[PDB]
Amino acid sequence: SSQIRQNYSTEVEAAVNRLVNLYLRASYTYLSLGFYFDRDDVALEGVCHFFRELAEEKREGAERLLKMQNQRGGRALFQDLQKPSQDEWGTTLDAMKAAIVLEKSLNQALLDLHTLGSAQADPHLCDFLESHFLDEEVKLIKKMGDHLTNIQRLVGSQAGLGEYLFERLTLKHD
Amino acid sequence: SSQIRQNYSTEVEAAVNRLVNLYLRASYTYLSLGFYFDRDDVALEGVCHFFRELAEEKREGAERLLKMQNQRGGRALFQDLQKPSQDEWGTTLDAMKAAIVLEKSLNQALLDLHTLGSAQADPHLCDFLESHFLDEEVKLIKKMGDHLTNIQRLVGSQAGLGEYLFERLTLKHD
Amino acid sequence: SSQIRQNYSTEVEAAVNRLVNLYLRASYTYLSLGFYFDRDDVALEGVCHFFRELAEEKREGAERLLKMQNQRGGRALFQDLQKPSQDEWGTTLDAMKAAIVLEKSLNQALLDLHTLGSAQADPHLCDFLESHFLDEEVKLIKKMGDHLTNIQRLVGSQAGLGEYLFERLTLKHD
Amino acid sequence: SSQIRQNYSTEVEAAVNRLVNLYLRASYTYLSLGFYFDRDDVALEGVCHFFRELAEEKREGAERLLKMQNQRGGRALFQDLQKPSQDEWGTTLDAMKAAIVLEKSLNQALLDLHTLGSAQADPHLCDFLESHFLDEEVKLIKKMGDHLTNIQRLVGSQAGLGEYLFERLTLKHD
Ligand SMILES: [Cl-]
Ligand SMILES: [Cl-]
Ligand SMILES: [Cl-]
Ligand SMILES: [Cl-]
Ligand code: NA
Ligand code: NA
Ligand code: NA
Ligand code: NA
């Protein structure tokens, strides 16, 4: 059982398990986005790489949460991972909009857990989120917003040209 | 407008713009202090360098605030920068006293913004200040207090000798 | 007071202080331009970097003037720094037009100070401006004019595409 | 005679020869100052080195003038070098005062030659002085003024202590 647990509420323990589920769901969503942009009839390598890198990032955030759960003496509990919301993700613009929606949902879940931690007087939890999650999320949302603006600027009357150019000249590819 | 802004109050946005103004005013004050100590009739190179380095530090703090404003989806708004409070800054002791007064005013503005952020349940803001500003300010005020004590010890009956020695043996020069 | 001052008119001393104010105002204008292009709803990194680099250049020109003021035995006097003329800067084309207007105003202030120096038979002042300011300004205005022409060529019927391409393929970014 | 001389007035030629004499006189004055501070009953090594370095600098300025005279097709004419104004130079403060008097006299001779060159429409002469002499002189006078202020600050009630400290902690020695 637990010889180490101290100042770690059941409420936080459960909310940490839920947040793990959210991050793993987000990782799965990004795996799907990545492989969609690798289709031969989509073929935007930079976009594929962007989302594959995010899949890895979100899995790593879940892993950090799970490590912390054990450091505090809580017990990891895993639930089913729901499949992503779509099977096909449309244009790069559609995809980047869906991504920022997903990130704002994760960000709100971080803020909600921070609020709970604050209410439970759990400063280690609050510090953990501040130190490893909140700014990383703000930076990522800023990046996505920058991308959305550039994608939107490029639609013009020539959407295919713009989608190609964005992939070639903004996103990282081989 | 804003596709990214989340949990970022208008109150904090405005107070961040005011704090930018305060840091840029402080930078300007230190530019003036630096060039005063470079006058041929003042000629304390170490003192000049101390204050020139602080001008740069304060500008860099303003720049970090402005970067954060954009990361959060707020809008930078610039106001006039008032000129420094003095044209001539007296002795090294007078200057270092004015500097610690200025730093305590910046520190209180940091604390006030932290309080606002706390009241607005904005943990990213609170973390940002804690991580990049509050300890830097405490360390700087401690340094200035150490300097004031050594300057004061050196006045004795021989103020010019003491002011020379402090500049030569404590402050960094070529 | 002054044990060093020689052949340095009160008229030049005052005009040097005014020119410092102009360069610091220009630096502030460029800080504002830079952060505007870093907004998530503007998001032109190359444009942001261009103007941030100019902010630094103009501050450095002010610092050189202030160093010279002290070398000559004049007294630096600082005035309020008025806020930039706009809070939002429009398109890259609008911004680059505003920049060349600002540079031509600085250039005329340089020429005016040169004329004063000439009239005061102050060859050190005249040399100083020729050696550190006049050609730097001519080169910068030429660069801006080259940029304006390329920006203008790119508007065509597809303004967003052109603004993206200019930022990606002419301006320096990561 | 002269196959090369072009746009080089007899007035400038003669004034260049006079300026050579002035620089060589100044060099001789600094040789005397240097050896005075090397006396066993004066013994301020840093002060000795300061003035010995200036002797070399002034000789080098004379040599540059003589090189230029020949480049223009004028004829070097040498006159007697009057001995320095004093045999003993008093305190470091007395010496540094005499040095700034001497430098302001050289500086005025530079400005006077510039005026003549301007009146003779001799832009190569004017450029030569601006490029190799006027700023070097301004920088040197600023340095001397900085030194005088520090020396003066150190007199206090304890002149010998202050003169030692200045030599040890400001001036370059082994
Ligand atoms: Cl489902
Ligand atoms: Cl004011
Ligand atoms: Cl204004
Ligand atoms: Cl004689
Ligand atoms: Na909270
Ligand atoms: Na607080
Ligand atoms: Na002119
Ligand atoms: Na002249």
Curated annotation (Swiss-Prot), chains A, B, C, D:
Primary site of residence: cytoplasm
GO MF annotations, alphabetized: ferric iron binding; ferrous iron binding; iron ion binding
GO cellular component: autolysosome; autophagosome; cytoplasm; cytoplasmic vesicle; ferritin complex
Keywords per UniProt: Acetylation, Cytoplasm, Cytoplasmic vesicle, Iron, Iron storage, Lysosome, Metal-binding
Protein's GO biological process: intracellular iron ion homeostasis; iron ion transport
Region (Catalytic site for iron oxidation): 53-60
Family listed: Belongs to the ferritin family.
The name this protein goes by in its record: Ferritin light chain
Protein's organism: Equus caballus (Horse)
